[PDB]
Amino acid sequence: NEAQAIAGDRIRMFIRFPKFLLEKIQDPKQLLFAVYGLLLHEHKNAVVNFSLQRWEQYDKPVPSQEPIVVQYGVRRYTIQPLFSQGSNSPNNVHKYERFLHPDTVSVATCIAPVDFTQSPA
């Protein structure tokens, strides 16, 4: 509903740009960088609970109380999750399962600073 500034066009905006974070923001005619957008309350953050499968032909397990760099989408955060069984849960009540299962679905539980559009993690 609250979509006002028109996409499709070209735009010249005065984006306030801090002097702190001026190491790796470059001018890509030959290099690779991109820039994204935010929301109102995406400025706030929340607590997430992922669904994870094991990667295919990736047999060896990982203990699941350990910092894994989570992407849900593309961007990277070394989040400290809590995997729990990804069964069909009627009551939506989970476990503090410590570690992983080598085949089935896992449900992470962690705090992440949230990008709310259901991506393949």
Binding site: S51, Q53, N88, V105, Q118
Partner: protein, 144 residues
């Protein structure tokens, strides 16, 4: 006299007689009024593809005892909302909503295989790729 005229001028009656008794047959009246065209959301087709609306809420018209991983779908040739079904059931992980299927009946134009209202259409091919070489662990079996 067996309740009928017989005499060899009476055919005037008879082809008007059966003409008014074909309507007591069922598929005759179903057919010659275009009821398959004014209804039956395939519209006389054999398949239809459409986006999955969402996960489905189970309303018991008996009996298959679980949340049957079924998919509310709405077609794109018509846009008429039907509850659907996947066989080889489970694996609720591998497509989002608003995503493609290919629908086909159960064998009676469905109407009954589990406790779900109006579930009569097996999904054949999600997003153009099949299910039978996708339950075969080549590819992966979708979600709602």
């Amino acid at each position: 006299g067996k309740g009928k005229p017989r005499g060899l001028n009476s055919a005037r009656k008879l082809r008007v007689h059966r003409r008014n008794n074909r309507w007591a047959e069922n598929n005759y009246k179903k057919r010659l009024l275009g009821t398959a065209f004014k209804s039956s959301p395939f519209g006389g087709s054999s398949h239809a593809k459409g986006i999955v609306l969402e996960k489905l809420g189970i309303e018991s018209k008996q009996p298959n005892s679980a949340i049957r991983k079924c998919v509310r779908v709405q077609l794109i040739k018509n846009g008429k909302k039907v509850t659907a079904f996947v066989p080889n059931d489970g694996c609720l992980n591998f497509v989002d909503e608003n995503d493609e299927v290919l629908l086909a009946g159960f064998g009676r134009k469905g109407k009954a295989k589990g406790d779900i209202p109006g579930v009569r259409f097996k999904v054949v091919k999600v997003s153009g790729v099949s299910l039978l070489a996708l339950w075969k662990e080549k590819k992966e079996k979708p979600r709602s």
